[PDB]
């Protein structure tokens, strides 16, 4: 049960979902909980005096914000999500996120296209670290851009390759992918010539 | 006070560093037709205004640090 924090009915849904899941053993995720620190303190107090089901899990997804209560941080286990340390780590994360069955489809060139996409994403995200030289500003090149690029690659490869096992590299729609990534997927965030 | 004396010395040194005069450009019937003059007049105007404001503020700070004048809200904010 996924609930986005921020509204009073959102708090009611969160309370009801937690009360149901601590008995049924289902998972409850609450997003952007950093926007309600007082309700976070109340939630920590509620969680301390509780004996939930063995399979119950409560995920609280937030941004790193000093307003998050300290007692909640001590009560839970913290996982920090941030850009991967390097190109190799970025490519490993990309290859882990993308399902194997998606890459290993009918065209044998899809694997190489996905590898090139992963390398491009890793290079761009690593260039983001050097803010004035790698880019001009800290662009939000993230997972959404990678997913959109993968969807575009899949769409245009299935369009060009009508279920064939192999497609000649000359026939791959390079212009389509390049233009859509430069103008729509990655170039949409770019506001600099 | 220690911070009062430190700010007095700093403001006196800054007043020594910053220049004191900047004369505005003179308008002429043929000077206006020159875009270079149309830009340099804006440059000198902004520079002179900022210089006058900064010099007045630093003089007020020095006056406060010697106790000659009382602290105001703007003077308190500037000193802070």
């Amino acid at each position: 049960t996924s609930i986005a924090i921020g509204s009073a009915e959102g708090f009611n849904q969160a309370d009801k979902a937690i009360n149901t899941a601590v008995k049924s053993g289902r998972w409850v995720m609450l997003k952007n909980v950093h926007l309600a620190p007082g309700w976070l303190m109340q939630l920590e107090k509620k969680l301390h005096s509780l004996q939930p089901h063995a399979c119950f899990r409560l995920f609280l997804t937030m941004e790193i914000n000093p307003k998050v209560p300290v007692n909640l941080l001590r009560a839970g286990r913290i996982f920090v999500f941030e850009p991967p340390p390097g190109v190799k780590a970025n490519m490993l994360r990309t290859f882990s996120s993308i399902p194997v069955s998606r890459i290993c489809k009918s065209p044998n060139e899809r694997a190489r296209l996905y590898f090139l996409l992963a390398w491009f994403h890793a290079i761009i995200q690593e260039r983001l670290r050097y803010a004035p030289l790698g880019w001009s500003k800290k662009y939000e090149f993230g997972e959404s851009d990678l997913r959109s690029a993968c969807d575009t690659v899949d769409t245009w490869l299935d369009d060009t390759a009508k279920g064939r096992q192999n497609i000649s590299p000359d026939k791959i729609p390079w212009s389509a992918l390049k233009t859509l990534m430069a103008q729509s997927i990655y170039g949409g965030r770019v506001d600099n010539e | 006070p220690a911070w009062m004396r430190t700010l007095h010395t700093t403001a006196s040194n800054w007043l020594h560093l910053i220049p004191q005069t900047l004369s505005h450009l003179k308008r002429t019937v043929e000077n206006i037709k020159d875009p270079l003059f149309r830009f340099f007049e804006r440059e000198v105007k902004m520079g002179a205004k900022l210089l006058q404001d900064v010099r007045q503020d630093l003089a007020d700070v020095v006056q406060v640090c010697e106790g000659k004048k009382k602290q105001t809200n703007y003077l308190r904010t500037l000193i802070n």
Binding site: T152, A176 | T72
Partner: protein
């Protein structure tokens, strides 16, 4: 006798006038012809006033008087009846046509049956005798109509659920408010009333076409008159239900648009694949079909031609038929350009412009395709374009057309868009199209972000219109919460419409996170709709919105346009950002948008014009001086290009008219060839940009024009008729009018520029410093336009910052989801509805006040081209063409680029309104308007003649003002503040002359005496107006300068300044010292609160305040705390018996609500023919609202004090707005006096210049050492008369007092501690304490007097000290001062360090021994333990000191304590012990976690009831921890300062309090019956009985914060620093 003839005419008209009645479905006879009746009533009222003007009026006065009353009554009745009738009509249609409402809502159905019976009975009575007077003479008719209106309103408000269900029935009703939805549902039978509501439910359908029966819908029409005729007309008789035939109309609209598109494509296939096109055939085809249809057909033909050419070239080595496509496009473009070069009908002209834009885009695309050597139709260089494919073989007409971009495929929605302004399709609108279509194919939203003026909101609209979608634009703000956005989403999903939520980042971050859920579920529903596995035969795709299953239409989409570069905007959560595909729209291609715009408008030199005009705008941006109101962006180029097209059309029409009237020879080609397009563009550029320019930038911009456009000159038109109207209006308004370089020429030019801007922009801003003539400019323009065009001008002036944004725009109730209209919303909706003909008048909504993004960014869609006021409840209000939105501001330092860009600017400088103009206005008003309401007029004329030489250019007043601007004043000096002060003082001089004439009927003032008096008083008033708010040194400086520069006789004193002299009525200077006698105060009146020892400053300030108050002019007293501002004001008001003063104590949390509570208590609202008037309950008395801390109220982040804006509106405009019903309330018999500390003091803010313009400021400084010596020597001489042996010690003692005071005031300042404020208040308390000690004693040696003096010095100057060294300094300096001024005394006897005084061991206040006091306190503590509180206390010396101090304060009237010290030091326990000792009952508020402001109000009511009605002495002990909100501190501040909270007792609570006060007064033996006397007695009792003891910790920043949050804690509470135990 013409008055009698006209009265007889009116009598005959009203005796013959009958209500025009028309039958209503055989139910009743409804009144018809409201406009004629209202116009007749207005005309007759104006005629009666015109007769009141004449003198002969008297012989008929009473009769005419009687007439107006009847007339007024008529108006009043018919100001309600119409509304009633209208309401009933639609309500009837809801309770009769619909059968489900009786089962759903039976109770108010029966209620409406009863009210309908009453209404039909009344209508039958009217039908029996349709005479207007006979109807007016019906008993209780007015009350009956008001009761019917109230009941109808309650029923109408009780119909929300039915309206929601009906919205569910017809989804487009989600975009219609409850009022208009009720109107639509009720008036379903009478279709003619629904025509004004179709614009809110459809994109381009503004009205529908019916037959003569109004039973068959033959088609639809747009706002431009374009009509679409249905192939299958919709029959209303077959489908009586409103929603059913509305749905049929929408479906038939789509079907007929599809069929007409098919026919148009079949027709346009001829023009395609054709080498030469006949212009006549193309024009016939264009006229045959709609604008969107002809553009779509051209796009389809071009796309199919390009596809065929690419299929032909697919071989690679084949020929290139793409050149054929380019040639056909160029031929058609040449035909279109030739067509637009000659006169065309406006609809065909817009069609031709759209076709030119589309074909220029097509030509560019084809040239790019040829240049890229494209030979395959599957090349992405062709696939990335927007391609239109038509399939005539498709059975479903709605699916015959497909629009494809890359892999994205869309179906045309076939929504009728009317004639929409098409956007040049530049490269960024192509990139925008590509990115947004990619987002749509992924079932995501679109997010074009970037600065403002880039195309984000229109590019979204243009893409939606290109796909034939209904795009709804929403101007988001912080009030778009989860529920409002969810309901908007429900409406969009059910309709199938595009939602463009602009300024999306203005929502709260929590609200964005919450709305992410709805966006995600909507996108999931859309994605499951896209899968081919889904079949429409199955259950429709639904999503979970607002706990409801809402069907989702595949045509729906969500777009958000935002500018992330604004600071203070919300950050979208990542889970919300991942739902949208973002695109940076930063640099629009302005060169192409111009070139294409000028090409489509008929300019032959469009390329040269664009290449000259875009760099010109860049040059203006980068070369003109940087101003906050300058905008040279895209919304300013498109404003110039549109104006250029309009000006070219006007010039062509003018040339044709000249040719017609001079011979007969007209040729379109000759005119087009010989036309100065350069001059047209320059004229538009000037008309748009010159008004905003500052004085120095005009020559720069004209030099830029000469550089970029050499040889062309801008000669502005001479609007002779408008200038004559302006001259007449200025003459009747006492305003100076001038032509060119004459006095007032700049102002008249500014007025003409404002008139020019009104015609181009529906949003205006008059930007300029206070007193630059903006208000007079637009008022005179409105009156002149009314007199010239004959269109009545109505102006609604709104102060946007004097009220909250909720009160300005409206409030959505979080519980019942009911919308309450704000001020601007109510005004705009009333104009739009046009119940009383508001659409036939020129409506100007002037936002006079400060502009900040928070309130004005809600007007982006209004001041844009959407012209829509978007509300959170999904309602959109279209701006009528006759409405102008005006912003009269003094600066734009807080407005953003989005606001500045959307509005036309007129810059008023202080040089526009010269001082000669103000002098002329003053002199004309003096010579024309009598001061009494004629000997007074003759006196004014003579005085104006005498003052004429000095009120000239380079005169005495002008030079004096110029010199005074160089001095230093306690407040910022403005010209109009000084001028208003001077004019008020001169009016007072004229009134003084009139009073002298009245006092001497036999011998009135002669010419020479009047001249002498007026000249001397002019010098005196210049001194007191140009230097009143400055120190004595600056007053002396101004006096010396005037003596240098004046020729008026002046006092010949060698050193006494002129400011020390007054002007006697005999025309001679007389010293002020002659009015300052050495008075002898009574012994029992020593240092009393109302006793004033006259001094020079006292008498001068009293005279000045009397001068300013007698004119009812609001005024301000600025000075250090305790200087004597309140004392001087009360002493001056004592000379004005017809003025009742009410004291308000401003704090940092003060809002206009305090003033509203004071008005609700001391004043009343009454209804008059002219509106609502708020006047004091007392008759013939003027209420003086004395505000004590005017500059304390909090200034927001945009530099505005809301209460200061409220007071400025109430002074400048003479009233305010009631937000309960948004009704203008006019103040009567109310004036304003304010008091404040200098703005440089901590916590004080500088007052607005607009506010300061209306309030003269007088600087009341601390009395000098000589003045202090005089005042307190008089007090000490009065006091020491009790003991004769001490009388000879009156002179030294005072000196010692003064000396010590001065020393303390020099040693302890606010730099050390915030509460280290020493004032003559301390000296008054010193005299009071010594007098109280000496009063019971019959004899006392000098040593006892010195001991009392030292004790009082310790209690006043040492109790507040924080550090020990300060207290040691105080002790040592008291000793030294006493020895210095009292030598040869027993030092040890009078200065034994334990200086203790107490009345516990005796009847009198005599010195007490420390050990005896300790034993007595021990015994009393034992009794205290055994009775009240059994908490043993250890007694040490500081405890004895503290209990003595607390007893001292508890024995004083209105004695409040502020005990500051560490928690656990015993402050509360000692306070309770002393209160028990003195018999006071201890009251403490029991604060818990649920303790709110209402609980504190109840506790305050209990305390006030006990201490004011029951005569019970109460010590109210309050801690800083008990304060949970700032309202606690506000009420405590008011109670501490005044002794009564104004809004605490309201409703039945006030009645109960009045009954208890009457009982208490009867117990005391007083005869009080009136509520005012009862409340005054209650306040006196509360003052005498309630002692508030405030305890807090010794915080550093907390004390400074409290010094502003609760000022009375440091002025009315004695501060005791207990601190920590030493």
């Amino acid at each position: 006798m013409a008055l009698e003839e006209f009265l007889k005419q009116i009598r005959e008209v009203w005796n013959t006038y009958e209500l025009d009645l028309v039958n209503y479905q055989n139910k009743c006879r409804l009144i018809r012809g409201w406009d004629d009746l209202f116009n007749k009533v207005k005309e007759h009222i104006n005629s009666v006033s015109a007769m009141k003007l004449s003198p002969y009026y008297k012989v008929f006065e009473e009769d005419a008087l009687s007439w107006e009353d009847k007339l007024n009554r008529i108006m009043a009745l018919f100001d309600v009846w119409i509304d009633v009738q209208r309401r009933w009509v639609y309500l009837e249609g809801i309770f009769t046509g619909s059968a489900d409402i009786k089962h759903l809502l039976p109770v108010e159905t029966q209620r409406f049956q009863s009210i309908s019976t009453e209404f039909l009975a009344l209508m039958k009575k009217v039908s029996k005798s349709p005479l207007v007077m006979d109807v007016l003479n019906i008993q209780g008719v007015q009350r009956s109509l008001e009761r019917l209106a109230d009941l109808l309103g309650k029923i109408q408000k009780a119909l929300g659920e039915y309206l929601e269900r009906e919205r569910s029935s017809f989804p487009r009703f989600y975009f219609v408010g409850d009022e208009d939805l009720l109107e639509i549902i009720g008036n379903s039978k009478n279709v003619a009333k629904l025509q004004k509501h179709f614009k809110k439910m459809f994109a381009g359908v503004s009205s529908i076409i019916l037959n003569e029966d109004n039973s068959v819908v033959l088609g639809i029409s747009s706002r431009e008159g374009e009509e679409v005729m249905f192939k299958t007309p919709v029959s209303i008789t077959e489908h009586p239900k409103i929603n059913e035939w509305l749905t049929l109309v929408e479906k038939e609209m789509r079907v007929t648009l599809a069929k007409l598109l098919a026919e148009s494509v079949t027709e346009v296939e001829i023009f395609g694949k054709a080498t030469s096109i006949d212009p006549n055939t193309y024009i016939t085809w264009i006229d045959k079909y709609q604008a969107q249809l002809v553009v779509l057909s051209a796009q389809i033909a071009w796309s199919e031609n390009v596809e065929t050419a690419l299929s032909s070239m697919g071989g690679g080595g084949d020929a290139a038929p793409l050149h054929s496509v380019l040639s056909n496009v160029e031929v058609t473009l040449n035909v279109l350009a030739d067509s637009v070069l000659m006169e065309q009908p406006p609809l065909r002209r817009r069609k031709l412009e759209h076709l030119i834009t589309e074909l220029v885009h097509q030509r560019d695309v084809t040239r790019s395709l040829i240049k890229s050597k494209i030979d395959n139709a599957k090349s992405f260089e062709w696939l990335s374009q927007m391609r239109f494919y038509f399939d005539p073989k498709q059975t479903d007409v709605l699916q015959q057309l497909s629009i494809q971009m890359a892999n994205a495929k869309f179906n045309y929605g076939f929504e009728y868009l009317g004639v929409q302004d098409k956007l040049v399709q530049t490269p960024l609108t192509d990139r925008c199209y590509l990115t947004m279509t990619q987002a749509l194919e992924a079932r995501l939203g679109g997010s074009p972000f970037g600065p403002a003026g880039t195309g984000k909101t229109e590019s979204v609209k243009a893409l939606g219109h290109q796909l034939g979608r209904f795009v709804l634009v929403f101007n988001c703000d912080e009030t778009f919460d989860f529920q409002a956005m969810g309901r908007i989403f429900v409406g969009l999903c059910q309709v199938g419409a595009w939602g463009c939520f602009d300024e999306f980042n203005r929502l709260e971050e929590r609200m964005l996170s919450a709305v992410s859920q709805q966006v995600q579920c909507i996108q999931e529903a859309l994605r499951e709709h896209s899968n081919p596995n889904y079949d429409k035969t199955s259950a429709p795709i639904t999503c979970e919105l607002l706990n409801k299953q809402v069907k989702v239409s595949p045509d729906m989409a969500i777009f958000i346009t935002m500018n992330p570069g604004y600071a203070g905007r919300s950050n979208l959560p990542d889970n919300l950002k991942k739902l949208f595909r973002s695109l940076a729209m930063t640099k629009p291609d302005r060169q192409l948008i111009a070139q294409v715009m000028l090409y489509s408008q008929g300019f032959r030199t469009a390329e040269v014009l664009a290449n000259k005009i875009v760099p010109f705008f860049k040059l203006c941006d980068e070369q003109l001086s940087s101003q906050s109101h300058y905008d040279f962006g895209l919304r300013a180029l498109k404003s110039v290009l549109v104006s250029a097209g309009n000006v070219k059309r006007e010039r062509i029409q003018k040339i044709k008219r000249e040719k017609e009237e001079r011979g007969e020879a007209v040729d379109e080609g000759e005119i087009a060839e010989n036309l100065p397009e350069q001059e047209i563009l320059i004229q538009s550029v000037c008309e748009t940009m010159v008004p905003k320019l500052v004085a120095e930038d005009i020559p720069l911009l004209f030099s830029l024009l000469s550089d970029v456009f050499p040889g062309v000159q801008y000669h502005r038109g001479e609007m002779t008729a408008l200038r004559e109207e302006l001259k007449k209006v200025c003459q009747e308004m006492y305003l100076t009018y001038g032509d060119g370089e004459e006095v007032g020429g700049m102002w008249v030019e500014k007025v003409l520029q404002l008139y020019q801007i009104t015609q181009i922009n529906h949003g205006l801003m008059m930007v300029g410093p206070s007193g630059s003539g903006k208000s007079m400019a637009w008022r005179v323009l409105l009156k002149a336009l009314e007199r010239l065009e004959g269109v009545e001008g109505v102006a609604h002036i709104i102060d946007p910052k004097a009220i909250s944004k909720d009160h300005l725009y409206g409030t959505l109730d979080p519980n019942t989801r009911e919308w309450t209209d704000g001020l601007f919303t109510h005004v705009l909706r009333k104009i739009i509805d046009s119940v009383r003909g508001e659409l036939q008048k020129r409506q100007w909504i002037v936002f006079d006040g400060d502009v900040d993004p928070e309130w004005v960014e809600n007007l982006n869609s209004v001041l844009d081209d959407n012209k829509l006021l978007t509300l959170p409840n999904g309602e959109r209000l279209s701006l009528p063409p006759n409405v102008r939105i005006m912003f009269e501001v003094q600066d734009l330092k807080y407005a953003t680029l989005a606001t500045v860009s959307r509005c036309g600017m007129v810059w008023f400088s202080e040089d526009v309104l010269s001082t000669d103009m103000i002098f002329n206005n003053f002199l004309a008003r003096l010579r024309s308007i009598p001061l009494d309401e004629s000997p007074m007029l003759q006196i004014q004329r003579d005085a104006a003649t005498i003052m004429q030489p000095y009120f000239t250019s380079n005169g005495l007043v002008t030079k004096a003002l110029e010199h005074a601007f160089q001095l230093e004043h306690i407040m910022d000096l403005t010209r109009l503040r000084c001028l208003g002060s001077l004019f008020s003082m001169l009016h007072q001089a004229c009134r003084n002359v009139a009073q002298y004439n009245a006092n001497h009927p036999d011998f009135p003032m002669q010419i020479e005496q009047l001249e002498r008096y007026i000249q001397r008083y002019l010098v005196y008033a210049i001194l007191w107006s140009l230097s009143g708010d400055s120190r004595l040194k600056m007053r002396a400086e101004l006096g010396e300068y005037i003596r240098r520069i004046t020729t008026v006789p002046l006092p010949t004193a060698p050193n006494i300044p002129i400011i020390d002299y007054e002007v006697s009525i005999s025309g001679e200077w007389s010293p002020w010292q002659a009015k300052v006698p050495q008075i002898e105060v009574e012994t029992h009146k020593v240092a009393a609160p109302d006793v004033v020892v006259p001094t020079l400053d006292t008498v001068r300030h009293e005279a000045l305040l009397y001068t300013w108050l007698a004119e009812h002019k609001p005024l301000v007293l600025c000075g250090p705390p305790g200087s004597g501002k309140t004392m001087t004001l009360f002493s001056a008001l004592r000379a004005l018996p017809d003025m009742e003063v009410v004291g308000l104590n401003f704090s940092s949390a003060t809002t206009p609500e305090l003033l509203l509570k004071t008005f609700d208590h001391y004043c009343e609202y009454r209804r008059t023919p002219n509106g609502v008037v708020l006047a004091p309950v007392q008759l013939g008395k003027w209420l003086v609202l004395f505000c004590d801390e005017i500059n304390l109220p909090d200034m927001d982040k945009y530099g505005t004090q809301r209460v200061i804006s409220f007071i400025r509106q109430m002074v400048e405009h003479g009233g305010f707005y009631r937000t309960s019903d948004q009704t203008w309330v006019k103040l009567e018999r109310i004036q304003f006096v304010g008091a404040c500390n200098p703005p440089t003091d901590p916590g004080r803010k500088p007052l607005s210049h607009r506010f300061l313009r209306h309030v003269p400021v007088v600087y009341v400084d601390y009395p000098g050492p000589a003045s202090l010596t005089q005042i307190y020597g008089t007090f000490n001489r009065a006091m020491l008369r009790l003991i004769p042996s001490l009388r000879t010690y009156a002179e030294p003692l005072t000196a010692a007092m003064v000396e010590f005071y001065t020393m303390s005031q020099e040693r302890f300042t606010q730099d050390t501690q915030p509460h280290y404020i020493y004032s003559p208040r301390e000296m008054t308390r010193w005299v009071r304490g010594i007098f109280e000690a000496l009063r019971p004693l019959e004899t006392l040696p000098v040593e006892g007097l010195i001991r009392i003096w030292a004790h009082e010095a310790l209690r006043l100057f040492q109790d507040r000290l924080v550090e020990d060294e300060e207290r040691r300094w105080t002790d040592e300096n008291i000793d030294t001062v006493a020895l210095k001024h009292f030598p040869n005394i027993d030092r040890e006897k009078a200065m034994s360090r334990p200086i203790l005084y107490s009345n516990w061991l005796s009847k009198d206040y005599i010195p007490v021994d420390q050990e005896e006091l300790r034993d007595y306190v021990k015994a009393r503590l034992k009794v205290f333990y055994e009775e009240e509180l059994d908490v043993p206390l250890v007694l040490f010396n500081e405890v004895l000191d503290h209990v003595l101090r607390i007893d001292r304060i508890f024995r004083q009237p209105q004695g409040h304590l502020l005990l500051i010290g560490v928690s656990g030091a015993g402050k509360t326990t000692l306070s309770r012990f002393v209160a028990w000792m003195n018999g006071l009952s201890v009251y403490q508020i029991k604060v818990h976690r649920k303790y709110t402001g209402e609980d504190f109000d109840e506790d305050l009511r209990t305390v006030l009831r006990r201490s004011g009605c029951k005569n019970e002495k109460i010590a109210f002990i309050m801690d800083e921890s008990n304060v949970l909100d700032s309202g606690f501190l506000e009420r405590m501040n008011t109670l501490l300062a005044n002794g009564e909270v104004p809004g605490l007792f309201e409703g039945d609570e006030y009645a109960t309090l009045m009954t208890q006060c009457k009982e208490g007064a009867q117990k005391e033996g007083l005869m009080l019956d009136s509520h005012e006397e009862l409340y005054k007695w209650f306040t006196s009792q509360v003052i005498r009985n309630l002692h508030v003891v405030f305890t807090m910790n010794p915080s550093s920043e907390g004390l400074k914060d409290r010094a502003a949050t609760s000022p009375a804690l440091f002025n009315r509470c004695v501060l005791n620093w207990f601190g920590d135990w030493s």
